[PDB]
Structure formats: structure tokens, C-alpha cells
Amino acid sequence: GKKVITAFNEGLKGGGGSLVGGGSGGGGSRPWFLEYCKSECHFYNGTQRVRLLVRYFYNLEENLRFDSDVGEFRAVTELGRPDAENWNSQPEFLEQKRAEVDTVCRHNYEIFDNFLVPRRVEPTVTVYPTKTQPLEHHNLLVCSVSDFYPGNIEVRWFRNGKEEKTGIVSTGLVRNGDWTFQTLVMLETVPQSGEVYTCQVEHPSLTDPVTVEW
Amino acid sequence: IKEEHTIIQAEFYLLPDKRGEFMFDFDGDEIFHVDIEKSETIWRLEEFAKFASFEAQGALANIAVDKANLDVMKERSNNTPDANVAPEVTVLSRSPVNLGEPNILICFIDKFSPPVVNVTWLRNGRPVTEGVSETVFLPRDDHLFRKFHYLTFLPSTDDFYDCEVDHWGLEEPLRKTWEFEE
Numbered sequence: 001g002k003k004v005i006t007a008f009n010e011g012l013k014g015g016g017g018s019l020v021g022g023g024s025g026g027g028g029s030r031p032w033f034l035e036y037c038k039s040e041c042h043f044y045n046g047t048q049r050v051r052l053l054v055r056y057f058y059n060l061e062e063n064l065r066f067d068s069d070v071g072e073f074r075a076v077t078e079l080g081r082p083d084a085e086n087w088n089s090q091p092e093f094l095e096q097k098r099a100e101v102d103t104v105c106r107h108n109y110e111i112f113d114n115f116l117v118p119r120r121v122e123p124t125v126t127v128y129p130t131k132t133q134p135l136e137h138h139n140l141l142v143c144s145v146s147d148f149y150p151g152n153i154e155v156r157w158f159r160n161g162k163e164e165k166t167g168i169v170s171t172g173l174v175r176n177g178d179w180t181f182q183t184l185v186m187l188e189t190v191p192q193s194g195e196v197y198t199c200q201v202e203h204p205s206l207t208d209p210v211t212v213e214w
Numbered sequence: 215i216k217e218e219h220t221i222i223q224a225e226f227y228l229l230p231d232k233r234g235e236f237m238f239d240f241d242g243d244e245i246f247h248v249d250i251e252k253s254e255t256i257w258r259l260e261e262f263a264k265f266a267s268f269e270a271q272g273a274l275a276n277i278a279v280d281k282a283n284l285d286v287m288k289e290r291s292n293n294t295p296d297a298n299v300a301p302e303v304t305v306l307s308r309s310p311v312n313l314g315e316p317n318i319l320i321c322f323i324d325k326f327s328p329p330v331v332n333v334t335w336l337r338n339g340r341p342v343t344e345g346v347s348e349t350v351f352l353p354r355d356d357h358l359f360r361k362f363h364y365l366t367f368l369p370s371t372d373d374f375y376d377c378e379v380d381h382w383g384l385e386e387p388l389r390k391t392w393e394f395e396e
């Protein structure tokens with residue numbers, strides 16, 4: 001299923017006037033001007049429930065918006081009202097943007113569903129203490145879970161069969177940018193011979209919970 | 215079942231630099247971006263190329279529109295600029311660091327605008343131009359951007375690494391350090 005991904009139609013804005021006194025953080029800086037647009041598809045259950053949300057930004061300001069549940073453009077700040085009024089008086093263009101929840105959002109999800117949705121990468125679990133010699137206080141037990149996808153994961157520490165729910169220090173879910181995540185869920189504890197600390201990892205690429213004792 | 219996902223088409227045109235960008239995002243990760251100058255689709259992961267295609271000319275067409283609209287916007291705002299938001303920088307490794315086993319240093323640049331930075335990896339105080347790669351400007355939920363720079367390295371207790379980032383919103387470049395600790 002190697003079909004062609006569709007892009008959203010970028011509408012052309014019109015001239016006319018200016019607005020009085022704009023903002024500008026300043027503090028001495030190079031002048032810059034940015035026209036930026038995010039056409040978002042929000043899937044609540046695949047293509048069953050979908051909502052298109054277009055977001056316009058001029059520099060640091062979000063100024064216009066298109067919520068498919070409205071069906072028209074709506075200014076967020078006054079900088080975007082001219083576009084709202086212009087685009088909204090254009091019937092064809094509206095029927096067109098409205099159609100994009102189907103011609104773009106749904107159409108593309110069916111494509112990505114073949115590979116991005118079902119993507120799974122199993123994690124690598126690794127435990128290990130932290131701090132040289134005695135911590136002169138509680139020591140750190142590190143549960144490293146790296147190289148996984150999707151992000152949904154549960155990593156639980158236990159102490160002698162009991163789940164430790166306090167004393168946890170974590171980086172939280174860390175995104176590497178290459179479609180893999182990682183995370184270190186540490187545990188402030190002083191080691192004690194026959195005593196045991198266990199890390200349990202649950203993730204959709206697994207069939208059964210990964211446990212690692214130390 | 216319940217499949218919750220978000221696919222985002224992010225595009226921008228920037229001045230005075232005259233830089234443009236068109237990319238697609240899936241759950242926070244880039245699927246692909248179009249090389250505007252070479253007019254070609256660049257998949258984030260090569261394996262992706264075989265399941266779908268995308269006409270790069272459509273990205274260019276869109277950028278042409280962003281270009282036009284920017285002038286309209288500068289007119290409407292009477293060419294009023296704004297502040298340059300400086301980025302946060304975090305240097306981390308991709309996997310647990312074991313001596314002698316090749317690893318990858320990640321330089322995460324976050325929360326900045328406009329979308330332009332100068333980045334330089336330093337290994338033992340000197341720039342590294344081999345075994346480095348980088349992403350385009352990635353969107354965030356808000357109005358700012360994040361970017362990733364990568365460095366292939368071989369863990370050894372004799373080296374110290376640095377990620378030097380420069381941005382118009384910074385007084386002087388921000389240099390984040392990294393070194394192996396057993």
C-alpha cells in the first residue's frame with residue numbers, strides 16, 4: 001500500500017490595510033519575520049473520530065485558526081481577522097478546507113496506518129547503582145529502559161516484592177528524534193545484601209512484562 | 215481498540231534569511247521534509263520510503279504561498295518585529311554508555327524562535343564535521359521549535375564533548391558539555 005500522501009491547500013492572503021501598534025519583545029535583536037502554519041489532524045480512534053485544526057503564526061503570535069468543527073476561519077488575534085473575513089466569504093475555498101478532513105487527514109492516516117501506526121521497537125532494560133562508594137545517604141538504583149517505540153510504557157520499581165511508589169527520580173519519557181525513546185527511572189535506596197530491588201517494564205511490543213532484579 | 219494519533223503538516227517561510235520549510239509530523243516525530251532547493255522528499259527513516267510517496271512540488275507550491283503571505287503580514291503589521299526567543303540545550307546519549315562500544319551523542323535544542331541556529335559539536339575542544347547529522351526545525355505544541363543534532367562517538371574516558379549552539383536571541387553562544395563518568 002504505497003499510495004501518495006496529500007498536502008493541505010495553503011490559501012493566499014490579500015492586502016488592504018494595516019493595524020495600529022504591534023508588539024515586539026525587543027531587548028536589542030535582529031529583525032525577523034515569520035509566516036508559519038500547522039495543519040493538524042487529530043485522530044481519537046483512527047479515522048472514526050477526526051478533527052482538523054489549522055493554526056497560523058506570524059512571528060511569535062498565533063493569529064488565525066480553522067477548526068473543522070466550526071467549518072470556518074476564526075481570528076485568534078486581530079492580525080488574523082482580515083484573512084478570516086476574506087477566506088470565509090469564499091464559498092469554494094471553505095468547502096475545500098472542509099473536505100480536507102477526508103481528502104487529507106483520513107486519506108493519509110490509511111497510508112500511515114500501514115507502517116507508522118503498527119511500528120514497534122522492543123526496549124532494552126538495564127539496572128545499575130549510582131555514586132562512587134557510599135552515598136553518605138540513600139543510594140541511586142538506576143532502571144534504564146532504552147531504544148523503544150511507541151512511547152507508551154510502564155516502568156515499576158519494587159523492593160523485596162513490594163512496589164516502591166516513593167523515592168523515584170526519573171527523566172520521564174525522552175524522545176531521541178529518530179523514532180525511538182528512552183527513560184531512566186531511578187530509585188533512592190541504600191543496598192542491603194540479600195535484599196532485592198526489581199524493575200518491571202510493560203510496553204505494547206512485549207507480550208510479557210520484563211523484570212530485572214538487582 | 216482506540217488509536218489516538220496526530221499527523222501535522224508544518225511549513226514556514228522566513229525573512230530576512232529567505233529560508234523555507236515543509237515537513238510532516240506523526241506523534242511528535244518527523245515522517246519526512248522536502249528539500250526545497252533540491253525539490254525532493256527526504257524521509258526521516260529510509261525504511262519509510264517504501265510504503266508511501268509524496269510529490270515535493272506540492273510542498274514548493276505551498277512555500278511559494280507562504281512567501282507571498284509573509285509580505286502581506288509584514289504590511290498588515292507595519293513591519294513590526296518581535297523578540298528572538300533563546301533555546302534551551304540538552305546533551306544526552308542515545309543508549310547507555312559502555313567503553314569501546316560505539317554510541318551517539320544527542321544535542322536537543324528546544325523552545326526557540328525564529329527557526330535558525332548555528333550548531334557546532336566539539337570533541338576535546340575542537341569542531342567535529344564527520345559523523346554528525348541534524349534534523350530540520352521540528353514543531354512543538356506551541357509556537358516555538360525544537361531541533362536535534364547528532365554525533366557518532368566511541369566512549370573513552372579521555373574525551374569530553376560539547377554542543378555549542380548560537381542563536382540571535384542569545385547574548386553569546388550556549389555551550390553544553392558532556393563527558394563519560396563510570
Ligand SMILES: *[C@@H]1O[C@H](CO)[C@@H](O)[C@H](O)[C@H]1NC(C)=O
Pocket residue numbers: 045046047048215216217
Ligand atoms: C476503534 O478502533 C479502531 C481503530 O482503527 C476503529 O477503526 C474502530 O472503528 C473502533 N473499534 C473499536 C472496537 O473500538
Ligand SMILES: *[C@@H]1O[C@H](CO)[C@@H](O)[C@H](O)[C@H]1NC(C)=O
Pocket residue numbers: 018020021292
Ligand atoms: C509604521 O512604522 C513607522 C516607523 O516605526 C511609523 O512611523 C508609522 O507611523 C507606522 N505606520 C502606522 C500606520 O502607524
Ligand SMILES: *[C@@H]1O[C@H](CO)[C@@H](O)[C@H](O)[C@H]1NC(C)=O
Pocket residue numbers: 330331332380381382
Ligand atoms: C550563524 O552563522 C552565520 C554564518 O552562516 C553567521 O553569519 C551568523 O552571525 C551566525 N549567528 C547566528 C545568530 O546565527
